[PDB]
Design an enzyme around this catalytic site. Sequence first.
Site, PDB file in Angstrom:
ATOM      1  N   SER A 198       0.759  -1.248   0.000  1.00  0.00           N
ATOM      2  CA  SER A 198       0.000   0.000   0.000  1.00  0.00           C
ATOM      3  C   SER A 198       0.799   1.314   0.000  1.00  0.00           C
ATOM      4  O   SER A 198       1.635   1.534   0.876  1.00  0.00           O
ATOM      5  CB  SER A 198      -0.959  -0.013   1.200  1.00  0.00           C
ATOM      6  OG  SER A 198      -1.406   1.289   1.507  1.00  0.00           O
ATOM      7  N   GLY A 199       0.509   2.196  -0.956  1.00  0.00           N
ATOM      8  CA  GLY A 199       1.180   3.489  -1.005  1.00  0.00           C
ATOM      9  C   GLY A 199       0.865   4.307   0.243  1.00  0.00           C
ATOM     10  O   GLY A 199       1.741   4.909   0.869  1.00  0.00           O
ATOM     11  N   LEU A 200      -0.402   4.337   0.626  1.00  0.00           N
ATOM     12  CA  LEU A 200      -0.783   5.073   1.824  1.00  0.00           C
ATOM     13  C   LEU A 200      -0.113   4.513   3.069  1.00  0.00           C
ATOM     14  O   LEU A 200       0.407   5.254   3.885  1.00  0.00           O
ATOM     15  CB  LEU A 200      -2.312   5.029   2.022  1.00  0.00           C
ATOM     16  CG  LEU A 200      -2.776   5.653   3.349  1.00  0.00           C
ATOM     17  CD1 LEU A 200      -2.314   7.096   3.436  1.00  0.00           C
ATOM     18  CD2 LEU A 200      -4.278   5.592   3.440  1.00  0.00           C
ATOM     19  N   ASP A 212       1.949  -0.730  -4.871  1.00  0.00           N
ATOM     20  CA  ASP A 212       1.149   0.386  -5.343  1.00  0.00           C
ATOM     21  C   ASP A 212       2.252   1.398  -5.727  1.00  0.00           C
ATOM     22  O   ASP A 212       2.869   2.011  -4.858  1.00  0.00           O
ATOM     23  CB  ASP A 212       0.311   0.905  -4.183  1.00  0.00           C
ATOM     24  CG  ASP A 212      -0.259   2.274  -4.431  1.00  0.00           C
ATOM     25  OD1 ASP A 212      -0.009   2.848  -5.514  1.00  0.00           O
ATOM     26  OD2 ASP A 212      -0.955   2.777  -3.513  1.00  0.00           O
ATOM     27  N   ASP A 222       2.025   4.326  -7.481  1.00  0.00           N
ATOM     28  CA  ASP A 222       1.466   5.609  -7.902  1.00  0.00           C
ATOM     29  C   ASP A 222       1.411   5.641  -9.416  1.00  0.00           C
ATOM     30  O   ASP A 222       0.748   4.790 -10.001  1.00  0.00           O
ATOM     31  CB  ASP A 222       2.288   6.795  -7.350  1.00  0.00           C
ATOM     32  CG  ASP A 222       2.431   6.752  -5.825  1.00  0.00           C
ATOM     33  OD1 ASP A 222       1.452   6.430  -5.115  1.00  0.00           O
ATOM     34  OD2 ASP A 222       3.539   7.051  -5.329  1.00  0.00           O
ATOM     35  N   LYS A 252       1.151  16.747  -9.235  1.00  0.00           N
ATOM     36  CA  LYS A 252      -0.013  17.633  -9.308  1.00  0.00           C
ATOM     37  C   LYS A 252       0.443  19.072  -9.640  1.00  0.00           C
ATOM     38  O   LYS A 252       1.183  19.689  -8.875  1.00  0.00           O
ATOM     39  CB  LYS A 252      -0.803  17.630  -7.989  1.00  0.00           C
ATOM     40  CG  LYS A 252      -2.107  18.439  -8.069  1.00  0.00           C
ATOM     41  CD  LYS A 252      -2.728  18.716  -6.709  1.00  0.00           C
ATOM     42  CE  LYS A 252      -3.409  17.495  -6.142  1.00  0.00           C
ATOM     43  NZ  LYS A 252      -2.478  16.345  -6.024  1.00  0.00           N
ATOM     44  N   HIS A 260     -11.468   1.250  -9.434  1.00  0.00           N
ATOM     45  CA  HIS A 260     -11.793   1.852  -8.155  1.00  0.00           C
ATOM     46  C   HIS A 260     -12.975   2.819  -8.163  1.00  0.00           C
ATOM     47  O   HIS A 260     -13.342   3.363  -9.188  1.00  0.00           O
ATOM     48  CB  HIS A 260     -10.580   2.579  -7.587  1.00  0.00           C
ATOM     49  CG  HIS A 260     -10.590   2.644  -6.100  1.00  0.00           C
ATOM     50  ND1 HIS A 260      -9.971   3.649  -5.393  1.00  0.00           N
ATOM     51  CD2 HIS A 260     -11.166   1.833  -5.182  1.00  0.00           C
ATOM     52  CE1 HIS A 260     -10.165   3.456  -4.098  1.00  0.00           C
ATOM     53  NE2 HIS A 260     -10.887   2.360  -3.943  1.00  0.00           N
ATOM     54  N   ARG A 314      -4.247   0.621 -12.924  1.00  0.00           N
ATOM     55  CA  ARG A 314      -5.297   1.211 -12.096  1.00  0.00           C
ATOM     56  C   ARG A 314      -5.995   2.344 -12.854  1.00  0.00           C
ATOM     57  O   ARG A 314      -5.378   3.352 -13.167  1.00  0.00           O
ATOM     58  CB  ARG A 314      -4.684   1.749 -10.815  1.00  0.00           C
ATOM     59  CG  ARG A 314      -5.691   2.157  -9.776  1.00  0.00           C
ATOM     60  CD  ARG A 314      -4.980   2.540  -8.515  1.00  0.00           C
ATOM     61  NE  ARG A 314      -5.896   2.835  -7.417  1.00  0.00           N
ATOM     62  CZ  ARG A 314      -5.503   3.052  -6.164  1.00  0.00           C
ATOM     63  NH1 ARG A 314      -4.211   3.006  -5.851  1.00  0.00           N
ATOM     64  NH2 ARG A 314      -6.399   3.310  -5.220  1.00  0.00           N
ATOM     65  N   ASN A 325      -1.983  21.505 -11.003  1.00  0.00           N
ATOM     66  CA  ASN A 325      -3.136  22.390 -10.939  1.00  0.00           C
ATOM     67  C   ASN A 325      -3.940  22.197  -9.655  1.00  0.00           C
ATOM     68  O   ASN A 325      -4.044  21.085  -9.119  1.00  0.00           O
ATOM     69  CB  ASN A 325      -4.033  22.180 -12.174  1.00  0.00           C
ATOM     70  CG  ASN A 325      -3.307  22.456 -13.475  1.00  0.00           C
ATOM     71  OD1 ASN A 325      -2.823  23.564 -13.706  1.00  0.00           O
ATOM     72  ND2 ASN A 325      -3.228  21.447 -14.335  1.00  0.00           N
ATOM     73  N   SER A 326      -4.509  23.302  -9.182  1.00  0.00           N
ATOM     74  CA  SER A 326      -5.304  23.343  -7.962  1.00  0.00           C
ATOM     75  C   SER A 326      -6.720  22.828  -8.219  1.00  0.00           C
ATOM     76  O   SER A 326      -7.408  23.288  -9.135  1.00  0.00           O
ATOM     77  CB  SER A 326      -5.347  24.786  -7.442  1.00  0.00           C
ATOM     78  OG  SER A 326      -5.768  24.845  -6.090  1.00  0.00           O
ATOM     79  N   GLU A 362      -1.283   3.841 -11.765  1.00  0.00           N
ATOM     80  CA  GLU A 362      -2.561   4.513 -11.966  1.00  0.00           C
ATOM     81  C   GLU A 362      -2.457   5.630 -12.998  1.00  0.00           C
ATOM     82  O   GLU A 362      -1.443   6.317 -13.051  1.00  0.00           O
ATOM     83  CB  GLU A 362      -3.051   5.065 -10.614  1.00  0.00           C
ATOM     84  CG  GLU A 362      -2.100   6.096 -10.023  1.00  0.00           C
ATOM     85  CD  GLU A 362      -2.247   6.299  -8.524  1.00  0.00           C
ATOM     86  OE1 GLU A 362      -2.249   5.313  -7.758  1.00  0.00           O
ATOM     87  OE2 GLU A 362      -2.334   7.459  -8.095  1.00  0.00           O
ATOM     88  N   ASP A 391       0.851  10.685   1.603  1.00  0.00           N
ATOM     89  CA  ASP A 391       0.769   9.797   0.461  1.00  0.00           C
ATOM     90  C   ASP A 391       0.712  10.653  -0.803  1.00  0.00           C
ATOM     91  O   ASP A 391      -0.284  10.664  -1.527  1.00  0.00           O
ATOM     92  CB  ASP A 391      -0.471   8.911   0.581  1.00  0.00           C
ATOM     93  CG  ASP A 391      -0.572   7.904  -0.532  1.00  0.00           C
ATOM     94  OD1 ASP A 391       0.449   7.682  -1.228  1.00  0.00           O
ATOM     95  OD2 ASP A 391      -1.670   7.330  -0.697  1.00  0.00           O
TER      96      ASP A 391
HETATM   97 MG    MG Z   1      -1.996   4.687  -3.244  1.00  0.00          MG
END
Ligand code: MG
Lengths: 282, 287, 281, 282
Positions: free
Chosen positions: B43-45, B82, B84, B117, B184, B153, B119-120, B111, B55
């Site tokens: 798990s990434g988290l 995982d 990402d 990231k 998911h 994913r 952009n907001s 995934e 994460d």
């Molecule tokens: Mg993850």
Amino acid sequence: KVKKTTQLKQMLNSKDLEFIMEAHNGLSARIVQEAGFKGIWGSGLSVSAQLGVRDSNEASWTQVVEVLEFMSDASDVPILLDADTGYGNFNNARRLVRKLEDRGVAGACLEDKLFPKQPLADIEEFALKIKACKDSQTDPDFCIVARVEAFIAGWGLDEALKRAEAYRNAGADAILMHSKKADPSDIEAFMKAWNNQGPVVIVPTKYYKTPTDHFRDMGVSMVIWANHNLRASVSAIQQTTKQIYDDQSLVNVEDKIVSVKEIFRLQRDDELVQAEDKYLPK
Amino acid sequence: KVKKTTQLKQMLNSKDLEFIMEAHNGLSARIVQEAGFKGIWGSGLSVSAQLGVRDSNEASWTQVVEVLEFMSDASDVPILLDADTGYGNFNNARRLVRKLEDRGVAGACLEDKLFPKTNSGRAQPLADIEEFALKIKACKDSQTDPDFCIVARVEAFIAGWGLDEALKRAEAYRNAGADAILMHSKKADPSDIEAFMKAWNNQGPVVIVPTKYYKTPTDHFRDMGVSMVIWANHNLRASVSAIQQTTKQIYDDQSLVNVEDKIVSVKEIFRLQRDDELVQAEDKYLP
Amino acid sequence: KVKKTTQLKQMLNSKDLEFIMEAHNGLSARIVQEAGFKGIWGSGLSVSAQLGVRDSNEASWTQVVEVLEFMSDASDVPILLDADTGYGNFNNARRLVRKLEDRGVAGACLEDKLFPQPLADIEEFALKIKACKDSQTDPDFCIVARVEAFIAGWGLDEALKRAEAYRNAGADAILMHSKKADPSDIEAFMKAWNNQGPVVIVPTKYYKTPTDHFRDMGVSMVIWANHNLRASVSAIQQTTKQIYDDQSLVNVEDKIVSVKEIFRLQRDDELVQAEDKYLPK
Amino acid sequence: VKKTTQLKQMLNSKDLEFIMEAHNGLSARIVQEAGFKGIWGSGLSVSAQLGVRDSNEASWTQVVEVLEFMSDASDVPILLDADTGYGNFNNARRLVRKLEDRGVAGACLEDKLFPKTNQPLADIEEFALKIKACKDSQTDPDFCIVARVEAFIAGWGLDEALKRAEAYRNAGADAILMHSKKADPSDIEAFMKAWNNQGPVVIVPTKYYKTPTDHFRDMGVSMVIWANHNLRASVSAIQQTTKQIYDDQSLVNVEDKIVSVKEIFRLQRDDELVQAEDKYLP
Ligand SMILES: [Mg+2]
Ligand SMILES: [Mg+2]
Ligand SMILES: [Mg+2]
Ligand SMILES: [Mg+2]
């Protein structure tokens, strides 16, 4: 505002009984902090354990330092690292001391046992080691706590004392006197003999039934709760893994555990959510 | 015996519903192996959280690989990481695939969202469909163990694009070589999963994470033909629970007496560390 | 002594033309200091190369930081790291900055290319430079913004529009780069910059232009970008070919440093003295 | 053909084999492009490039990482100078495992005391078990364990060089590295006379470098290690280039004496990535 090294310095040298709780990764370090403990104990057994290896120098000292870096990054209170014998001779120990200072760690606890593998290491050798550490520190408040393994190895009060005094004289900021016995005898016998030449630190894992005030009367300076979080964690993980395995569903675990949102809070996820709104263009 | 990559590949392609359990460190990976589970979810988290960070790509891909190296040394069943988005473009993904193979890791889950990231109720743009498909292919073309697995994913539902996007992406990735598709949903119900399985027509193995819709009868997944289920982060959560409670008790009590009989013994830890083997070996190699 | 961060900031704000020399590992950092350079450029291309990988963020940022930790441990002068685009968004950058401080690195150079011929959005990169200035704990840690407008094909308008955006965002210096074989792009930028902040240049491609011409333009600092790496490579290639063919060391033994020189460069001396004091007789 | 296999074959071959030292990924690829069939990962060379001393300062995992990078950049095997294994038999085997996973073809271990407490060498018996411990842990049967004998460097006789060498060969060693600090091959000649072809022999002719190579072929030596010349050559070019740019504050006097930037991109296999970006980015 107060340097972590300094906070640990004050606790060792305070005339009141202080407590530090074990943690073995960044997550547990935050939890011990939030609970309110004033310090964290970087348990050698717990760190090697969570990594899935043995507590006998299997993970390199730098792999252990990195775990501690993440722990230091996630806490504001001092971390006293259990550094075995320092992972080598005086040179390895001083190199370790400088790396920990830079990582934010507050102190290191070194024991006088043979490395690698009840004879122990020479007193003069281990004294020169503490002194080397003490002469290498760039932060006067970084702590070196000398651990005497005389009692554990079968020697008498005489060996213990001789060792504690040689170490304290080399510059140790505190002495960790341990005993695997089921009661505080080696410790009470030591406390009387010590004469308060310096702060003493104890690990009451085996004589945990002995009341704590008894440690206050013996003049003890700091108590270490050594590995209860690793042990608490393993039980919970063993339980939940068995529960899910047997059920093939989460129905019986979902309400007996922390939510996903409590995980994000501990990771300080909100700080990022807020940084992203301030740093990511419209 | 059988390579871990092969064990994971057989689970993904088997007809029956397979399960893998979350682990986030060496210790929890051994416990999972002991419980009987046939596989582990990296798990990434759970990994970033134990390290104490978010994460969101804070730990480097090599610090994550290192946590996983310990997990793999401590377990005999396959681990699906995982990963990402592969930590960059297609080139970072294949270099990662090579390091994982060498470390004993069985497969990687990638995934299709944007990275990093920049952009907001407007849908959230994902990676370009053609771009992600080529990254999956780059990985398959680069792996040295033919059985290493690349799980794709699909983020369509989560990002706000309906079934239509989900299926085009799954089809595009499967056709690019993915060994399985992980579908998911943000929902507290299995509706998105149900709808996708209906339209998928079993074009390839599908993996799911029932975390948010956990009350959904497990038998229902078998009826849809889902190939594997991932219990995503419950060991991490049980651990936090246990460490928060043990710490608070010792803090308040200022004694151990009230916890000593509610946690495993120190000798239990020695057994999980396989301390016995060291004992026996020092007997064979120390003069 | 004074903090390395502070030494770098003073060199950038100085009115004298300052020089920083390329180093790619612990050993080369040490040689650069002994030579007299007041600073070191932790070249992205050199670090990557010495590891045997491409300069495209293949090694990870913590792997690059570790190389630099060894470099910082081996030197007393500031090291300015070529941090590509910060290895991610603003958050990756601010995390990186924090680790560089802790390891003793003096500053970082961030470029506005897209990561992983359009560049990163101006506002976005500006907000990233800002995130770094808002997060650093040592106020003297230097954030150098690298404008890739000229190399990207854009013109002086872009280079300028971007230099100003980044400097207004808090950048401590602007590295203006050009691919031309003459200083035309650099002289035009300096002419229209009106000295809005310290400027840094890398004369790699126009190395024929006299250095005094840069002083006259008011350039604050010059980066000798990759010569120690290129030097090391041509010597290793020749040394290896000579031994390979000769199947003997007789024709290289007198063109290379003795092993004693290596020990000195390792400060092996200090350890012998230390073992002398701390190991029981 | 496996790298481990490639090495083993060079050690047990008829001809005299040569391996050239490298200390990073870049130098490993150069050694390979030149024609060498093997690479010597020098302990002195690796620690030096890191700027630390050759005395166990860098952790063993830090050394392994450097080797991992060298491995990825070369197709010929790498024999790693692994000090004494960085601990007792256990540390030694863990190192062997990690080295195999990284693609290293073999480790070279020396019979001395570790760490330093300062000439006594490691207990002959213990190192033998150490050598064995590593042999018993290999997962690849062709991974080579070269036992380096320090008797002659420790100041012992030939009787001791042969006593250790024969013991380490019976333990499992794939070859024996007989070293001599003499500026002539006397020690090597003496030992070769004595040894009686009981195993492949590896030597480091750094001090007795005037000794003709055929002399080594005559005595039956199996492999020669060019131990530290690329490092030394590098250092010369760097001190000179640096001095030349410092003095001139210009690059006009070094730009024609150094390899070009394109040559660096070639050595990094940049074109291989362009081709990839070609096929994998829309
Ligand atoms: Mg993850
Ligand atoms: Mg311990
Ligand atoms: Mg660069
Ligand atoms: Mg060596």
